[PDB]
Structures are given as structure tokens and as C-alpha cells.
């Protein structure tokens, strides 16, 4: 059930104003948080993401994600951000230089290679460089904002990289 | 695992051109089809949807969904369309009169009432009327193309309907 979310390790969301309260609860695991954000149990809002305090074992169910306005994202090795994929835009806007979706299969069905891995191919596209371009796992991303759109390094030794078949919002 | 798809009962996809082949396989259940479209097993394309022939127990893995161009959708009581949610636009374009996402919680956390149900409230918004507006299950839809955007009939007897908190593609 935690599979239906997008984890951002050691990350927490912060916003700005006083008008915001954060529904929390002493939970047993991060799964409990998730199986309640999904089924929107006792919420007076629409849960789009939640943060799990690993040290206190507490959840903080939010009505927005790291992508909302005014929404910043703090650091902490005891926190874990989890965002409902239902609320992370799945289509591209242009060359999709701001794509944050979990797609990780190239236009022709080849699984992607982790950005934090140098096999099968070696590259310069590290998470430590393109910070903010979200080069997590093996997601389809576009660091340089190239024309092709989201792409990734193929796990097929015969293919360096390749574009990903991700829909335009103003499609075809 | 079939939960990570959007079923459209007794429906099949048809396209137009000759240049298209359809990967199929004699499968045991519709789950088998799904657990292979998801993990893109032996595909030379990106599976966005699949159709299960209940009578032949065969899958047809497609590289597009009912939303692609040239793509039509036939009828048959032995067929079942299943579309990867990853490829069904989750954001709104305007008043979102063409929204086909699986969201079904109102802006304030109230679960939605099935369009094919007359409880708690009675209405005229039937699937038989607004055909093409996809008034399936209890999804957030906008039949009349109103200003508010996607909405639905609340399951709370105290609330007739209410808007759903669904993101704009050119958000905020």
C-alpha cells in the first residue's frame, strides 16, 4: 500500500502561514499512515501527502505536496516524505523540464538505470549536480531541459539513454 | 494489483491503421495481464492499457489508452478495458470538463456517491444521459462543464454535492 506513494527520503514539508494545522497521529508504522491517507479516513480535507517521523512514529497528513505554492521542504534523517501519485502531475508541459512522475520505462519498454548508479553506463548526471531536478531512483527526468523531453539511462548495455513515452497535458 | 488500473466494463479499444500489432497472450486471469503491464515484462513498448477477453482468457497489451488519437472503443460483454492510471491525466485543463481520473473524495474529505445510485440524494445526472462524460463509479466529474470544475454527489446526507480538490495542469 506504500507502493501507491512516492517516497522522498529524509524530507519533510514546511509551508509559511499560521492558518494551517497539520493532522497528526501516533502511528505504528509508515504503512498505517499510508492506508489512511489513501482511504481518507477521518479527514476534513483531501490528503495529498504525509510525513512520517521515524523517531516519534507520528504521521502528518497534508492537504498538499512538495509541489504546492508556498510549500518548502525541510531536511531531517528521521523524516520521510510520501506523496500520493494521484496528485503529482503525470503529464508533460513542454519539454517537461519540471517532470516529477514515477515513470521509469523508456518509450520502447526498456527499464531505466538509477541516476545514482554507474552501470551499465557511466555519466555525469548525478543527484549531487542537478539538484532540484529530482534525479531520484530511475525515474524519467530531463535535467538539461532538452528538446526530447523526459528520458533516462537505459539498463540495456546496448542503449545509453532514450526518451520516455510520457503524455503532453495538451496531448495529441 | 488490478487496483492500480481503471476498469471500463464490457469495453475494448479499436484504432484505425495497419501499422499496429497488438501483443497478446493466453492468460489465466485479468490479474496476470495486469501484473505484466505494470512491470512491462517482455514489451518493446510502454503498456498504457490492456483488454481482457473473458471468453478466450486472452490479454491485449496496448501502447495507448481510450484517450489516444485515432483510438476508438468498441463494445462486447466479454471484454474488459483496464487503463494504467499513470497514463490518464490527473490534472485539470480549465473547468475540467474532460476529466477522466479516479479521484472520488470531495475537496473537504467526503467520499462520493455513485452516479448510478439515488442515495443519499436523487438526481438527473445518470450515465445514460451524459454519455461520454464518463459518469462511472463515484468519480469526480463535470457533466455540464460548470465553472467549479470536477465535483460529485456527496455520500453525506447533509451535503448534496461539492467540488473536488483536483490540481490544474498549469497549477498555482
CSV table of C-alpha atoms in Angstrom, one decimal:
chain,number,residue,atom,x,y,z
A,1,UNK,CA,0.0,0.0,0.0
A,2,UNK,CA,3.0,2.3,0.4
A,3,UNK,CA,3.7,1.4,-3.2
A,4,UNK,CA,0.9,3.7,-4.2
A,5,UNK,CA,3.1,6.7,-3.0
A,6,UNK,CA,6.4,8.4,-3.9
A,7,UNK,CA,8.9,8.4,-1.1
A,8,UNK,CA,11.5,11.2,-0.8
A,9,UNK,CA,13.9,10.0,2.0
A,10,UNK,CA,14.8,12.2,4.9
A,11,UNK,CA,12.4,15.0,3.8
A,12,UNK,CA,9.7,17.0,5.4
A,13,UNK,CA,7.3,19.7,4.2
A,14,UNK,CA,7.1,23.2,5.6
A,15,UNK,CA,4.8,26.0,4.4
A,16,UNK,CA,4.6,29.6,5.7
A,17,UNK,CA,1.3,30.8,7.2
A,18,UNK,CA,-0.5,30.3,10.6
A,19,UNK,CA,-3.9,29.4,9.1
A,20,UNK,CA,-2.6,25.8,8.7
A,21,UNK,CA,-3.0,23.0,11.2
A,22,UNK,CA,-1.5,19.5,10.5
A,23,UNK,CA,-3.5,16.4,11.3
A,24,UNK,CA,-1.1,14.0,13.1
A,25,UNK,CA,-1.4,10.7,15.0
A,26,UNK,CA,0.8,8.4,17.0
A,27,UNK,CA,1.0,5.5,14.4
A,28,UNK,CA,2.7,2.1,14.4
A,29,UNK,CA,4.4,2.2,11.0
A,30,UNK,CA,4.6,4.4,7.8
A,31,UNK,CA,2.1,1.9,6.3
A,32,UNK,CA,-0.6,2.9,8.8
A,33,UNK,CA,-0.2,6.5,7.7
A,34,UNK,CA,-0.5,5.5,4.1
A,35,UNK,CA,-3.5,3.2,4.4
A,36,UNK,CA,-5.3,6.1,5.9
A,37,UNK,CA,-4.2,8.9,3.6
A,38,UNK,CA,-5.4,6.7,0.7
A,39,UNK,CA,-8.8,5.9,2.2
A,40,UNK,CA,-9.1,9.4,3.6
A,41,UNK,CA,-10.4,8.1,6.9
A,42,UNK,CA,-11.2,10.9,9.2
A,43,UNK,CA,-10.1,13.9,7.2
A,44,UNK,CA,-11.8,17.2,6.6
A,45,UNK,CA,-9.5,17.7,3.6
A,46,UNK,CA,-8.0,15.7,0.8
A,47,UNK,CA,-4.7,14.0,1.8
A,48,UNK,CA,-2.1,14.6,-0.9
A,49,UNK,CA,1.0,13.6,1.0
A,50,UNK,CA,2.1,12.7,4.5
A,51,UNK,CA,5.3,12.8,6.6
A,52,UNK,CA,6.4,10.0,8.9
A,53,UNK,CA,8.6,11.0,12.0
A,54,UNK,CA,10.6,7.8,12.3
A,55,UNK,CA,11.8,8.7,15.8
A,56,UNK,CA,8.3,9.6,17.2
A,57,UNK,CA,6.5,7.2,14.9
A,58,UNK,CA,4.0,10.0,14.1
A,59,UNK,CA,2.3,10.9,10.8
A,60,UNK,CA,1.5,14.3,9.5
A,61,UNK,CA,-1.3,14.2,6.8
A,62,UNK,CA,-1.1,17.2,4.5
A,63,UNK,CA,-3.6,18.7,2.0
A,64,UNK,CA,-0.8,19.5,-0.4
A,65,UNK,CA,2.6,18.1,-1.6
A,66,UNK,CA,6.1,19.3,-2.2
A,67,UNK,CA,4.7,20.8,-5.3
A,68,UNK,CA,2.2,23.3,-3.9
A,69,UNK,CA,2.8,27.1,-3.7
A,70,UNK,CA,4.5,28.5,-0.6
A,71,UNK,CA,5.4,24.8,0.2
A,72,UNK,CA,9.0,24.3,1.0
A,73,UNK,CA,10.7,21.0,2.1
A,74,UNK,CA,12.9,20.6,5.1
A,75,UNK,CA,15.6,18.0,5.9
A,76,UNK,CA,15.9,15.5,8.7
A,77,UNK,CA,17.2,11.9,8.8
A,78,UNK,CA,14.2,10.9,10.9
A,79,UNK,CA,11.6,12.2,8.4
A,80,UNK,CA,10.1,10.6,5.3
A,81,UNK,CA,8.0,12.3,2.8
A,82,UNK,CA,5.4,10.3,0.9
A,83,UNK,CA,3.3,11.8,-1.9
A,84,UNK,CA,0.1,10.5,-3.4
A,85,UNK,CA,0.9,9.9,-7.1
A,86,UNK,CA,-2.7,10.9,-7.8
A,87,UNK,CA,-1.5,14.4,-7.1
A,88,UNK,CA,1.9,14.5,-8.8
A,89,UNK,CA,1.3,15.7,-12.4
A,90,UNK,CA,1.7,12.8,-14.7
A,91,UNK,CA,1.7,14.7,-18.0
A,92,UNK,CA,4.4,17.0,-19.5
A,93,UNK,CA,4.3,20.7,-20.0
A,94,UNK,CA,6.6,21.4,-23.0
A,95,UNK,CA,10.0,19.7,-23.0
A,96,UNK,CA,8.9,18.6,-19.5
A,97,UNK,CA,11.9,20.1,-17.7
A,98,UNK,CA,9.9,20.0,-14.4
A,99,UNK,CA,8.6,16.4,-14.6
A,100,UNK,CA,8.4,14.7,-11.2
A,101,UNK,CA,6.5,11.5,-12.1
A,102,UNK,CA,7.4,7.9,-11.2
A,103,UNK,CA,7.6,6.6,-14.8
A,104,UNK,CA,10.7,4.6,-15.4
A,105,UNK,CA,10.4,2.7,-18.7
A,106,UNK,CA,11.8,4.1,-22.0
A,107,UNK,CA,9.5,4.8,-24.9
A,108,UNK,CA,10.3,1.2,-26.1
A,109,UNK,CA,9.8,-0.8,-23.0
A,110,UNK,CA,13.4,-0.8,-21.6
A,111,UNK,CA,13.6,-0.3,-17.8
A,112,UNK,CA,15.7,2.7,-16.6
A,113,UNK,CA,19.0,2.8,-14.8
A,114,UNK,CA,19.4,4.5,-11.4
A,115,UNK,CA,20.8,8.0,-11.6
A,116,UNK,CA,22.9,7.1,-8.6
A,117,UNK,CA,24.4,4.1,-10.4
A,118,UNK,CA,27.2,4.0,-13.0
A,119,UNK,CA,26.2,0.7,-14.6
A,120,UNK,CA,25.6,-0.3,-17.4
A,121,UNK,CA,26.8,3.2,-18.5
A,122,UNK,CA,28.8,5.9,-16.8
A,123,UNK,CA,27.8,9.5,-16.8
A,124,UNK,CA,27.9,13.0,-15.1
A,125,UNK,CA,24.2,13.2,-14.4
A,126,UNK,CA,24.4,12.8,-10.6
A,127,UNK,CA,21.8,13.8,-8.0
A,128,UNK,CA,24.6,15.9,-6.4
A,129,UNK,CA,24.8,18.0,-9.5
A,130,UNK,CA,21.3,18.6,-10.9
A,131,UNK,CA,19.9,19.3,-7.5
A,132,UNK,CA,16.2,20.2,-7.7
A,133,UNK,CA,15.8,18.3,-11.0
A,134,UNK,CA,14.8,15.4,-8.8
A,135,UNK,CA,17.1,12.7,-10.2
A,136,UNK,CA,15.7,10.1,-7.8
A,137,UNK,CA,15.7,6.3,-8.4
A,138,UNK,CA,15.5,5.5,-12.1
A,139,UNK,CA,12.7,8.0,-12.9
A,140,UNK,CA,12.4,9.5,-16.3
A,141,UNK,CA,13.8,13.0,-16.0
A,142,UNK,CA,15.1,15.9,-18.1
A,143,UNK,CA,18.0,17.7,-16.2
A,144,UNK,CA,19.3,19.8,-19.1
A,145,UNK,CA,15.8,20.7,-20.3
A,146,UNK,CA,16.5,19.1,-23.7
A,147,UNK,CA,14.0,19.0,-26.6
A,148,UNK,CA,13.3,15.3,-26.5
A,149,UNK,CA,11.6,15.6,-23.1
A,150,UNK,CA,11.9,13.2,-20.2
A,151,UNK,CA,14.5,10.5,-20.8
A,152,UNK,CA,16.7,8.2,-18.7
A,153,UNK,CA,19.8,5.9,-18.9
A,154,UNK,CA,18.7,2.5,-20.1
A,155,UNK,CA,19.6,-0.6,-18.2
A,156,UNK,CA,20.3,-2.2,-21.6
A,157,UNK,CA,24.0,-2.1,-22.2
A,158,UNK,CA,23.2,-1.6,-25.9
A,159,UNK,CA,21.3,1.6,-25.2
A,160,UNK,CA,22.9,4.6,-23.4
A,161,UNK,CA,19.7,6.5,-22.9
A,162,UNK,CA,16.3,7.0,-24.6
A,163,UNK,CA,13.2,9.2,-24.4
A,164,UNK,CA,10.2,8.1,-22.3
A,165,UNK,CA,6.7,7.9,-23.8
A,166,UNK,CA,5.1,10.4,-21.4
A,167,UNK,CA,1.9,12.3,-22.4
A,168,UNK,CA,1.6,16.0,-23.0
A,169,UNK,CA,-1.1,17.7,-20.9
A,170,UNK,CA,-2.4,19.4,-24.1
A,171,UNK,CA,-1.7,15.9,-25.6
A,172,UNK,CA,-2.5,14.9,-29.2
B,1,UNK,CA,-2.6,-5.3,-8.4
B,2,UNK,CA,-5.7,-4.7,-10.6
B,3,UNK,CA,-6.3,-1.9,-8.2
B,4,UNK,CA,-3.6,0.1,-9.9
B,5,UNK,CA,-5.8,0.3,-13.0
B,6,UNK,CA,-9.1,1.8,-14.1
B,7,UNK,CA,-11.7,-0.7,-15.4
B,8,UNK,CA,-14.3,0.1,-18.0
B,9,UNK,CA,-16.6,-2.8,-18.1
B,10,UNK,CA,-17.5,-4.5,-21.4
B,11,UNK,CA,-15.2,-2.3,-23.4
B,12,UNK,CA,-12.5,-2.8,-26.0
B,13,UNK,CA,-10.1,-0.5,-27.8
B,14,UNK,CA,-10.0,-0.2,-31.6
B,15,UNK,CA,-7.8,2.2,-33.6
B,16,UNK,CA,-7.5,2.6,-37.4
B,17,UNK,CA,-4.2,1.9,-39.2
B,18,UNK,CA,-2.4,-1.3,-40.3
B,19,UNK,CA,0.9,-0.3,-38.8
B,20,UNK,CA,-0.3,-1.6,-35.4
B,21,UNK,CA,0.2,-5.1,-34.0
B,22,UNK,CA,-1.3,-6.0,-30.6
B,23,UNK,CA,0.8,-8.1,-28.1
B,24,UNK,CA,-1.5,-10.8,-26.8
B,25,UNK,CA,-1.2,-13.9,-24.7
B,26,UNK,CA,-3.3,-16.8,-23.4
B,27,UNK,CA,-3.5,-15.8,-19.8
B,28,UNK,CA,-5.2,-17.3,-16.7
B,29,UNK,CA,-6.9,-14.3,-15.2
B,30,UNK,CA,-7.1,-10.5,-15.8
B,31,UNK,CA,-4.6,-10.2,-12.9
B,32,UNK,CA,-1.9,-11.9,-14.9
B,33,UNK,CA,-2.4,-9.3,-17.7
B,34,UNK,CA,-2.1,-6.5,-15.1
B,35,UNK,CA,0.9,-7.8,-13.3
B,36,UNK,CA,2.7,-7.8,-16.6
B,37,UNK,CA,1.5,-4.5,-18.0
B,38,UNK,CA,2.7,-2.9,-14.8
B,39,UNK,CA,6.1,-4.5,-14.7
B,40,UNK,CA,6.4,-4.1,-18.5
B,41,UNK,CA,7.7,-7.7,-18.8
B,42,UNK,CA,8.6,-8.5,-22.4
B,43,UNK,CA,7.4,-5.4,-24.2
B,44,UNK,CA,9.0,-3.4,-26.9
B,45,UNK,CA,6.7,-0.5,-26.0
B,46,UNK,CA,5.2,1.1,-22.9
B,47,UNK,CA,1.9,-0.6,-21.8
B,48,UNK,CA,-0.7,2.1,-21.0
B,49,UNK,CA,-3.8,-0.2,-21.1
B,50,UNK,CA,-4.8,-3.8,-21.8
B,51,UNK,CA,-8.0,-5.6,-22.8
B,52,UNK,CA,-9.1,-8.9,-21.3
B,53,UNK,CA,-11.2,-11.3,-23.5
B,54,UNK,CA,-13.1,-13.0,-20.7
B,55,UNK,CA,-14.3,-15.8,-23.2
B,56,UNK,CA,-10.9,-16.6,-24.6
B,57,UNK,CA,-9.0,-15.5,-21.5
B,58,UNK,CA,-6.6,-13.5,-23.6
B,59,UNK,CA,-4.9,-10.2,-23.0
B,60,UNK,CA,-4.1,-7.5,-25.5
B,61,UNK,CA,-1.5,-5.1,-24.2
B,62,UNK,CA,-1.7,-1.7,-25.8
B,63,UNK,CA,0.8,1.2,-26.1
B,64,UNK,CA,-2.1,3.7,-25.7
B,65,UNK,CA,-5.4,4.1,-23.9
B,66,UNK,CA,-9.0,5.1,-24.7
B,67,UNK,CA,-7.7,8.7,-24.7
B,68,UNK,CA,-5.2,8.5,-27.6
B,69,UNK,CA,-5.8,9.9,-31.0
B,70,UNK,CA,-7.5,7.8,-33.6
B,71,UNK,CA,-8.3,5.5,-30.7
B,72,UNK,CA,-12.0,4.4,-30.6
B,73,UNK,CA,-13.5,2.0,-28.1
B,74,UNK,CA,-15.8,-0.9,-29.1
B,75,UNK,CA,-18.3,-2.8,-27.1
B,76,UNK,CA,-18.6,-6.5,-26.1
B,77,UNK,CA,-19.8,-8.2,-22.9
B,78,UNK,CA,-16.8,-10.5,-22.9
B,79,UNK,CA,-14.3,-7.7,-23.0
B,80,UNK,CA,-12.8,-5.5,-20.2
B,81,UNK,CA,-10.8,-2.4,-20.6
B,82,UNK,CA,-8.2,-1.6,-18.0
B,83,UNK,CA,-6.1,1.6,-18.2
B,84,UNK,CA,-2.9,2.4,-16.3
B,85,UNK,CA,-3.7,5.4,-14.1
B,86,UNK,CA,-0.2,6.6,-14.7
B,87,UNK,CA,-1.4,7.5,-18.2
B,88,UNK,CA,-4.8,9.0,-17.5
B,89,UNK,CA,-4.3,12.7,-17.0
B,90,UNK,CA,-4.7,13.6,-13.3
B,91,UNK,CA,-4.8,17.3,-13.6
B,92,UNK,CA,-7.5,19.6,-14.9
B,93,UNK,CA,-7.5,21.7,-18.1
B,94,UNK,CA,-9.8,24.7,-17.4
B,95,UNK,CA,-13.1,23.8,-15.7
B,96,UNK,CA,-12.0,20.3,-16.4
B,97,UNK,CA,-15.0,19.2,-18.5
B,98,UNK,CA,-13.0,16.3,-19.9
B,99,UNK,CA,-11.6,14.9,-16.6
B,100,UNK,CA,-11.3,11.1,-16.5
B,101,UNK,CA,-9.4,10.5,-13.3
B,102,UNK,CA,-10.3,8.1,-10.5
B,103,UNK,CA,-10.4,10.8,-7.7
B,104,UNK,CA,-13.6,10.4,-5.6
B,105,UNK,CA,-13.2,12.5,-2.4
B,106,UNK,CA,-14.7,16.0,-2.2
B,107,UNK,CA,-12.4,19.0,-1.5
B,108,UNK,CA,-13.2,18.5,2.2
B,109,UNK,CA,-12.7,14.8,2.5
B,110,UNK,CA,-16.2,13.4,2.0
B,111,UNK,CA,-16.4,10.3,-0.1
B,112,UNK,CA,-18.5,10.5,-3.3
B,113,UNK,CA,-21.8,8.8,-4.1
B,114,UNK,CA,-22.1,6.6,-7.2
B,115,UNK,CA,-23.6,8.3,-10.3
B,116,UNK,CA,-25.7,5.1,-10.8
B,117,UNK,CA,-27.2,5.5,-7.3
B,118,UNK,CA,-30.0,7.6,-6.0
B,119,UNK,CA,-28.9,7.6,-2.3
B,120,UNK,CA,-28.4,9.8,-0.2
B,121,UNK,CA,-29.6,12.2,-2.9
B,122,UNK,CA,-31.7,11.8,-6.0
B,123,UNK,CA,-30.7,13.5,-9.3
B,124,UNK,CA,-30.9,13.5,-13.1
B,125,UNK,CA,-27.2,13.0,-13.6
B,126,UNK,CA,-27.3,9.5,-15.0
B,127,UNK,CA,-24.7,7.6,-17.0
B,128,UNK,CA,-27.5,7.0,-19.6
B,129,UNK,CA,-27.8,10.8,-20.2
B,130,UNK,CA,-24.3,12.4,-20.1
B,131,UNK,CA,-22.8,9.7,-22.2
B,132,UNK,CA,-19.2,10.3,-23.0
B,133,UNK,CA,-18.8,12.4,-19.8
B,134,UNK,CA,-17.7,9.1,-18.2
B,135,UNK,CA,-20.0,9.2,-15.1
B,136,UNK,CA,-18.5,5.9,-13.9
B,137,UNK,CA,-18.5,4.7,-10.2
B,138,UNK,CA,-18.3,7.7,-7.9
B,139,UNK,CA,-15.5,9.5,-9.7
B,140,UNK,CA,-15.3,13.3,-9.6
B,141,UNK,CA,-16.8,14.5,-12.9
B,142,UNK,CA,-18.2,17.7,-14.5
B,143,UNK,CA,-21.1,16.8,-16.9
B,144,UNK,CA,-22.4,20.3,-17.5
B,145,UNK,CA,-18.9,21.8,-17.8
B,146,UNK,CA,-19.7,24.2,-14.9
B,147,UNK,CA,-17.2,26.7,-13.5
B,148,UNK,CA,-16.5,25.0,-10.2
B,149,UNK,CA,-14.7,22.1,-12.0
B,150,UNK,CA,-15.0,18.4,-11.2
B,151,UNK,CA,-17.5,17.7,-8.4
B,152,UNK,CA,-19.7,14.8,-7.3
B,153,UNK,CA,-22.7,13.9,-5.2
B,154,UNK,CA,-21.5,13.5,-1.6
B,155,UNK,CA,-22.4,10.4,0.4
B,156,UNK,CA,-23.1,12.7,3.4
B,157,UNK,CA,-26.9,13.2,3.5
B,158,UNK,CA,-26.1,16.8,4.7
B,159,UNK,CA,-24.3,17.6,1.5
B,160,UNK,CA,-25.8,17.3,-1.9
B,161,UNK,CA,-22.7,17.8,-3.9
B,162,UNK,CA,-19.3,19.6,-3.7
B,163,UNK,CA,-16.2,20.4,-5.7
B,164,UNK,CA,-13.2,18.1,-5.7
B,165,UNK,CA,-9.7,19.4,-4.9
B,166,UNK,CA,-8.1,18.4,-8.2
B,167,UNK,CA,-4.9,20.2,-9.5
B,168,UNK,CA,-4.8,22.4,-12.6
B,169,UNK,CA,-2.1,21.3,-15.1
B,170,UNK,CA,-0.8,24.9,-15.1
B,171,UNK,CA,-1.5,24.8,-11.4
B,172,UNK,CA,-0.7,27.6,-8.8
